[PDB]
């Protein structure tokens, strides 16, 4: 009920060689692309007269620990100039060297960062400096299904021995779990 | 004892505590919202100044650490390098709830739970985040444990 | 003598099973009540209507009372 | 940077008209008068009472409708109110409450071990709307600042059982709370 | 009553000890105390007297495990509460110089005597580990010495079960002789050695006497009523420590001579005027007991036990050990 | 996992799961909480699904 | 080039690194990550209703825009109509949150550049609107009040009228301040034409809220999406000409006054009718029900121990905070755990700003800068 | 007073920031002199 | 006059705050009066709203908050303008403690401890099961 026009026109004048999914939902509507496309098609919008993006507001990884294609990269970005907002959402593996769109918009340096160390996918072009959000040599990629809540070594505590250390975990009162699940 | 001499230096320690009492010096460490709450207490509101209480930034003369906030593995090295570089007489002062004992993030990983661990916390303050009422109740329990420093008496019996 | 000696410490005051032992029976005139003490919000102790057909005193569940029926 | 010469010159063209704007403008620059207006109303509230609430003997302002040092309440019998639902530990956004329980003597159940250490335990306020008969609750007082971690670990039940120090107290505010809650 | 390990090493994981540290306020204390909690066990300290002072052994372990609880000494009662409800007692009190209201007799060998009577009347202790020096019986000068021998034996006779060790003078991160030496040099002219000038001694680092006191501690069924000395990694001529020192500090050595009639007659003074009615400073460099144990010879009697019978000798006082003088 | 034998649903039936049979836990001396010291204390059938 | 560092008012923690030359900042760069907790795994670890105090925990200056976002997230996401009072008393207390800001940020800024008198003159009426925070629900801060479906309780009585003092005396004070800043040579010399940005760039680096509406671009996400009543709440939308730090400072405190516009159109529409809901299926039941009948207690039990379930689809939400395009990124799917909620803080854009934008000015420009961008890096990291 | 001649201080449109007690703030929140009684049902559904 | 001038007057020349309270009190009227001795006070007029309520603590040299009783604890925090005496007439019987202010620092029996922390003289032990323990 929000913008059925910039996308309608989008994708009826798309090339329709890298398109494997579209849905016009009412929550968002979903360009589904393939990752070898991609700055391709992001390059396509932000050009074009009509449905010229202009501003990428998120990048987001899902992760899913059951598929074949276990990540879900996903880019939020809306059009200032037609009132309008997309989100194209692509496929990643582990090591699957995806593009950058750092060229097109330079608003991607931190967020592909922070999808490089919170999750794990790679980033061939240049975006794929160090880590950002985590702190410094850490062992895993700590917001998939795989890194415990409460982190691998994680005391991190001052020695009169000799000044401060990082120890592995031994904390008291383990984090308990709910269940709160309901067979109807 | 010589009781007179007893009541000298019982008059010399009042004396020399409350001075250190009535111009203590804090330091912030302003890490999360608290530090909002803690600048209300230095607002005009609760005023902290009249207390004498003046937030000197460099830790070269100051007195007191206020931990105001919630630590961070990354951030542990800095504040025990901080805490080191201060003069003899030290106090830290835990506001918030994750300064002292973890508190929400206390169960995740990259959180330090509780500041206890890297500084030798003196007393350290209730809320989420504390009112400045509270904030200033912990600074004035302080004075109440400042208050009875018996030292010369100690050098006097050592 | 155990619960209370789990969780009390003092033993020094009467511990709540004590003072809910030392509160007399209500008896009652009818078959059913309802317990919650005096207003039905602000003092908890949902609805807990119950049975009155033993020669014994009817325990609540919630703030046990023992609620008695009066004659025959 | 063209265009900024040609700018500052119609900016200038512009208010530069006569020469009353001219002379009002340069001597306004010149003697301060921005200046003499700021220290005007810095010295107006100089003089101005103050706020400065004096904390030690008048203390701020609080509503009904506050969160600080739990309490758990019982009934005018005597008689505990918390029955061991799990409900408070359930809702607990922090997992911050540890409560454990066990069938007594007499038959009533109640908790053989309840505690919160109160750190851990941020103040949302979840507790106090869990509660099916208002057992644990928020009482108005947040002047506890020991020196000792452990205390801020409230004990298992005792110390919270003495929030009853102030029963009447807490009583008042859930009186004006029955209404509209 | 044997304990029971019940965790895995580390922090909150609770391995059964409960020890008692008398003196737990200083070097040794700080560090030995650290290598308790850190292995895991309750710790009690007492202080004489202060707020502050045990503070920072404070945080060297979870919630609850170290507990810092009383005025020490002079009073049977205190020291018995203290120790309540110990499982192992450890004595490091001693000064290294005397104080008008004491004096080397009076602490080392008299609070001996107490600690081993009040454990005899709380014998519910398992190890009383009592340290005390490089030092033998009253056949060395630094009255201290014998006093210390003296409250070796009766500790050893008051508890045939204990341990008493014997480590050679510490140099650590805060310790007694490096830094007077460095302080001395950056202030003024530079350093002095007394006696002779080539004295022998056997410096240790003193995590690696810690870590022989928690092996002791633990020594699963092997050594229950031993005294023995823990020397150093390799024999030290005095000169050549001082060498040691001015070549990790980066600067030029200059030593003083002539030490013994200068060291008497300028150290003699200040235990006269100290038993002369108020306190009296401390002795910087000219301590009584330092002129005695440098004019005599001490490294290793080779004929007891040793860290080699114990656990490995100190890393060694080049590298680590020494690396704290990079403050100056 | 098997369907809970105390109710009579179906929404929790059919869902494989991998556990790692981690049992390492004491009681904590102070309070009488449980510690622990395995980092995949609960994570396997937390979020692993 | 020098390599000078920034490790600094209280205006949060972050490390500066400046490769310098003479006075110039050749190339600004932030490390950031001294304040992370893991809110987001957190989250998933955690529940809904449990949740919401992360949200009211993030950008901890404006505590309540947060859950208007979290809350309008998961009612798109659930199809939970609210009523009309909720919405109208919601509307207020996120116009008052944006006082709140504007006035933190501004005076703080004021002191970074050297005035301190306006600080505290902010912060006495700070404390006058943390005590309508801490009377209508909670402490002064971090009031879990804004729940998905409506509010927690009913407001008191009397509110309105000491709405209606505060708003009377809070236009004065902001003639005062504005009197006092707006004009005086030394703030004008120090803080225009001091960080300019091109509208292009603007769009590009992805700024929001005032920053985007500083250089031209009229955009805010009332007008555009308008989600709430905000219609019926005609106001003004001011917009900058030249974006640089006077045009952005003269922007905020038109939002003072429009927002001020708003909290009085509010109090004299709010329609005196329910709160919260009409299901005691996503909104519990109240005390005198929950006690007396039967099936309010099942319900209340089942809310307060599994929460409410939320059907599989994932969806993106956007509130105009205080600061910029706040967003929320549910990925929730069946079970009453949201899978994967992902925060969208306008600190990653303003501070990629600073880095490009902190080029070829001075020290004293750098902390101007960062003054202007109203940093919070508790939303910057989260 | 001297000021007065030029800014707010100076504008018939103008308030000060103390307000007393009984202006501000008359009946306490708890013990206001009504008896509200919120909705929360709607008669048809109820 | 030298009784009540050592009593509860000079000791503000070195305290400073009880200068202030004096002053608002040479303005003030009396509203109640503490078991605990203390006085409240409400000077109600054209002073503020944030400061027409406060209370002198009848303990001169040592005066520390949360010597406050309950009653009187609401009554000064405004929450409810009902008086200490109309709560202490409520005071719920049948239990109670009586007041006692945050000690937290004048030794640990003083203060308090848990049932595990070993200066408590409970020192409970948490094991969940029991020992053969043969005779
Ligand atoms: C004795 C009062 C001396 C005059 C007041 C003063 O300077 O007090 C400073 C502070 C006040 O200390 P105080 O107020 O914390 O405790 C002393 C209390 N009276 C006065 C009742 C005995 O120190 C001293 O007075 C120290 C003793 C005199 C030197
Ligand atoms: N020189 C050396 O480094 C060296 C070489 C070999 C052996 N040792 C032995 O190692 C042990 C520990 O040495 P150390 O360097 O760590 O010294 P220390 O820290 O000063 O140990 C003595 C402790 O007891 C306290 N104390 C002082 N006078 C006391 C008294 N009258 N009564 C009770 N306690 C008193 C001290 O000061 P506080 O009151 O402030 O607590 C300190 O806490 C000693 O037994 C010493 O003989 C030392
Ligand atoms: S509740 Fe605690 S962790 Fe949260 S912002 Fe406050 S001080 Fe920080
Ligand atoms: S909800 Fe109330 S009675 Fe029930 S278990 Fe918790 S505090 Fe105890
Ligand atoms: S107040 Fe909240 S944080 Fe504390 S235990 Fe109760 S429900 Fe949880
Ligand atoms: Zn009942």
């Known amino acids: 009920m929000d913008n059925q026009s910039i996308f309608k026109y989008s994708w009826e004048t798309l090339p329709k060689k890298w398109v494997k999914k579209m849905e016009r939902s009412e929550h968002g509507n979903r360009f589904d692309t393939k990752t070898d496309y991609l700055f391709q098609l992001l390059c396509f919008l932000k050009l074009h007269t009509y449905t010229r993006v202009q501003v990428l507001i998120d990048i987001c990884g899902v992760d899913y620990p059951s598929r074949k294609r276990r990540f879900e990269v996903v880019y939020n970005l809306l059009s200032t100039r037609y009132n309008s907002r997309i989100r194209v959402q692509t496929s990643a593996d582990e090591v699957t060297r995806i593009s950058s769109v750092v060229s097109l918009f330079p608003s991607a340096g931190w967020w592909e960062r922070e999808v490089w160390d919170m999750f794990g996918v790679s980033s061939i072009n240049h975006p794929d400096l160090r880590r950002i959000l985590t702190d410094y040599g850490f062992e895993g990629h700590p917001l998939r299904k795989d890194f415990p809540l409460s982190g691998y070594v994680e005391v991190r505590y001052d020695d009169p021995e000799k000044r401060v250390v990082s120890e592995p975990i031994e904390m008291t009162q383990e984090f308990r779990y709910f269940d709160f699940a309901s067979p109807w | 004892v010589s009781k007179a001499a007893e009541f000298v230096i019982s008059k010399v320690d009042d004396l020399m505590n409350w001075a250190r009492r009535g111009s203590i010096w804090p330091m912030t460490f302003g890490l999360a919202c608290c530090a909002v709450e803690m600048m209300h207490t230095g607002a005009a509101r609760y005023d902290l100044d009249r207390f004498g209480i003046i937030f000197r930034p460099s830790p070269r003369q100051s007195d007191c650490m206020i931990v105001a906030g919630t630590l961070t593995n990354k951030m542990a090295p800095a504040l025990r390098k901080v805490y080191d570089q201060m003069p003899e007489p030290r106090w830290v002062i835990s506001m918030g709830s994750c300064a002292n004992g973890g508190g929400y993030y206390h169960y995740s990983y990259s959180v330090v739970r509780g500041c206890d661990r890297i500084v030798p916390v003196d007393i350290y303050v209730p809320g989420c985040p504390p009112t400045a009422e509270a904030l200033l109740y912990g600074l004035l329990q302080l004075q109440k444990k400042i208050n009875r420093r018996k030292d010369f008496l100690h050098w006097w019996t050592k | 003598s155990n619960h209370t000696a789990k969780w009390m410490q003092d033993t020094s005051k009467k511990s709540p099973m004590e003072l809910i032992n030392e509160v007399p029976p209500i008896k009652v005139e009818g078959r059913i009540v309802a317990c919650e003490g005096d207003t039905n919000p602000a003092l908890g102790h949902p609805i807990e209507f119950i049975c009155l057909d033993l020669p014994e005193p009817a325990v609540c569940k919630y703030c046990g009372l023992r609620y008695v029926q009066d004659h025959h | 940077t063209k265009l900024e010469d040609e700018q500052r010159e119609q900016l200038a063209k512009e208010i530069s008209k006569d020469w009353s704007s001219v002379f009002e403008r340069s001597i306004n620059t010149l003697f301060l008068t921005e200046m003499v207006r700021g220290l005007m109303l810095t010295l107006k509230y100089f003089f101005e009472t103050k706020v400065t609430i004096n904390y030690p003997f008048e203390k701020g302002p609080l509503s009904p409708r506050f969160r600080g040092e739990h309490a758990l309440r019982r009934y005018p019998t005597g008689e505990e109110r918390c029955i061991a639902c799990k409900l408070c530990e359930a809702i607990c956004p922090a997992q911050a409450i540890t409560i454990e329980a066990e069938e007594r003597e007499d038959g009533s159940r109640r908790t053989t071990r309840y505690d919160i250490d109160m750190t851990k335990c941020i103040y949302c306020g979840f507790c106090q709307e869990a509660c099916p008969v208002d057992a644990i609750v928020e009482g108005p007082n947040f002047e506890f600042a020991t020196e000792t971690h452990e205390e801020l670990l409230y004990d298992k039940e005792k110390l919270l059982e003495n929030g009853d120090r102030w029963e009447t107290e807490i009583a008042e505010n859930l009186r004006s709370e029955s209404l509209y809650r | 009553g044997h304990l029971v390990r019940k965790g895995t090493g580390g922090r909150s994981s609770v391995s059964g000890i409960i020890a008692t540290v008398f003196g737990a306020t200083g070097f040794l204390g700080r560090y030995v105390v650290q290598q308790l909690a850190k292995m895991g066990s309750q710790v009690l300290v007492p202080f004489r007297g202060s707020e502050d002072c045990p503070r920072h052994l404070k945080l060297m372990g979870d919630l609850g495990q170290i507990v810092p609880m009383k005025y020490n000494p002079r009073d049977e009662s205190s020291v018995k509460a203290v120790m309540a409800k110990a499982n192992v007692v450890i004595n490091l009190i001693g000064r290294d110089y005397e104080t008008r209201n004491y004096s080397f007799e009076e602490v080392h060998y008299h609070m001996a005597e107490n600690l081993a009577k009040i454990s005899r009347e709380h014998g519910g202790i398992l190890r009383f580990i009592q340290v005390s020096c490089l030092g033998a019986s009253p056949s060395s000068p630094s009255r201290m010495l014998r006093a210390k021998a003296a409250a070796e034996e009766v500790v050893l006779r008051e508890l045939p079960e204990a341990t008493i060790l014997k480590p050679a003078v510490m140099i650590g991160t805060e310790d007694r002789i490096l830094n007077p030496w460095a302080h001395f040099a950056k202030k003024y002219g530079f350093i002095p050695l007394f006696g002779n000038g080539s004295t022998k001694i056997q410096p240790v680092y003193v995590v690696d006497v810690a870590a022989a006191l928690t092996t002791v501690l633990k020594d699963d069924g092997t050594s229950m009523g031993k005294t023995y000395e823990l020397g150093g990694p390799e024999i030290f001529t005095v000169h050549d420590l001082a060498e040691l020192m001015y070549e990790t500090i980066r600067e030029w050595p200059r030593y003083v001579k002539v030490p013994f009639p200068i060291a008497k007659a300028l150290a003699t003074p200040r235990e006269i005027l100290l038993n002369k009615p108020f306190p009296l400073p401390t002795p910087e460099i000219l301590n009584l007991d330092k002129i005695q144990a440098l004019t005599t010879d001490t490294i290793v009697s080779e004929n007891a036990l040793t860290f080699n019978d114990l656990g490995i000798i100190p890393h060694k006082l080049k590298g680590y050990p020494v690396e704290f003088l990079i403050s100056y | ?49 | 080039n020098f390599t000078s560092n920034f490790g600094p008012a209280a205006h949060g923690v972050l490390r500066s690194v400046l490769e310098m030359n003479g006075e110039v900042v050749e190339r600004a760069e932030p490390h950031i990550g001294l304040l992370h907790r893991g809110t987001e795994k957190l989250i998933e670890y955690k529940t809904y209703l449990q949740a919401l105090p992360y949200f009211d925990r993030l950008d901890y200056v404006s505590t309540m825009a947060q859950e208007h976002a979290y809350s309008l997230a998961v009612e798109r996401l659930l199809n939970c109509e609210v009523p009309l009072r909720a919405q109208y008393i919601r509307v207020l207390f996120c116009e008052i949150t944006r006082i709140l800001n504007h006035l933190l940020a501004l005076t703080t800024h004021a002191m970074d550049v050297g005035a301190s008198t306006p600080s505290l003159w902010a912060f006495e009426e700070r404390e006058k609107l943390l005590e309508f925070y801490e009377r209508v629900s909670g402490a002064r801060m971090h009031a879990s009040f804004i729940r998905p479906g409506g509010v927690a309780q009913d407001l008191p009585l009397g509110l309105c009228r000491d709405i209606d003092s505060f708003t009377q005396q809070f236009a004065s004070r902001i003639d005062e301040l504005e009197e006092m800043l707006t004009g005086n040579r030394i703030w004008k010399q120090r803080l225009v034409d001091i960080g300019t940005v091109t509208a292009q760039q603007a769009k590009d680096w992805g700024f929001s809220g005032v920053m985007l509406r500083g250089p031209g671009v009229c955009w805010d996400l009332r007008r555009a999406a308008p989600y709430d009543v905000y219609d019926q709440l005609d106001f003004d939308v001011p917009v900058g000409t030249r974006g640089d730090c006077y045009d952005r400072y003269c922007i905020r405190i038109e939002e003072m006054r429009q927002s001020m516009r708003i909290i009085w159109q509010c109090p004299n529409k709010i329609p005196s009718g329910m709160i919260k809901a009409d299901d005691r299926k996503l909104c519990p039941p109240s005390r005198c029900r929950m006690k007396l009948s039967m099936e309010s207690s099942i319900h209340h039990f089942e809310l307060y121990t599994e929460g409410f379930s939320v059907p599989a689809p994932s969806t993106y939400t956007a509130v105009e905070a205080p600061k910029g395009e706040f967003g929320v990124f549910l990925v929730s799917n069946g079970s009453n755990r949201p899978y994967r909620c992902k925060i969208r803080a306008p600190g990653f854009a303003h501070l990629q700003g600073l880095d490009f934008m902190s080029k070829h000015h001075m020290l004293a420009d750098v902390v101007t800068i960062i003054g202007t961008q109203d940093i919070v890096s508790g939303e910057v990291d989260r | 007073k001297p000021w007065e001649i030029t800014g707010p201080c100076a504008d018939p449109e103008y308030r000060s920031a103390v307000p007393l007690a009984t202006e501000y703030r008359l009946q306490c929140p708890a013990t206001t002199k009504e008896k509200p009684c919120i909705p929360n049902s709607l008669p048809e559904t109820v | 006059l030298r009784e009540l001038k050592d009593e509860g007057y000079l000791r503000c020349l070195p305290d400073g705050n009880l200068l202030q309270t004096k002053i608002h009190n040479i303005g003030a009227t009396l509203v109640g009066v503490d078991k605990f001795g203390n006085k409240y006070y409400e000077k109600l007029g054209d002073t503020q709203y944030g400061r027409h309520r406060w209370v002198e603590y009848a303990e001169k040299s040592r005066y520390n908050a949360s010597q406050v009783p309950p009653e009187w604890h609401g009554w000064l925090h405004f929450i409810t303008d009902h008086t200490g005496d109309e709560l202490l007439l409520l005071k719920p019987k049948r239990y109670g403690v009586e007041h006692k202010e945050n000690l937290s620092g004048e030794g640990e029996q003083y203060i308090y401890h848990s049932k595990g922390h070993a200066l408590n003289p409970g020192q409970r032990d948490w094991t969940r099961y029991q020992p053969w323990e043969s005779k």
């Open chain 6, 1 to 49: 996992p098997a369907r809970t034998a105390s109710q009579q649903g179906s929404g929790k039936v059919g869902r494989w799961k991998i556990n790692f049979l981690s049992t390492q836990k004491w009681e904590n001396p102070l309070m009488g909480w449980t510690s622990t010291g395995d980092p995949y204390a609960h994570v396997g059938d937390s979020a692993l699904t």
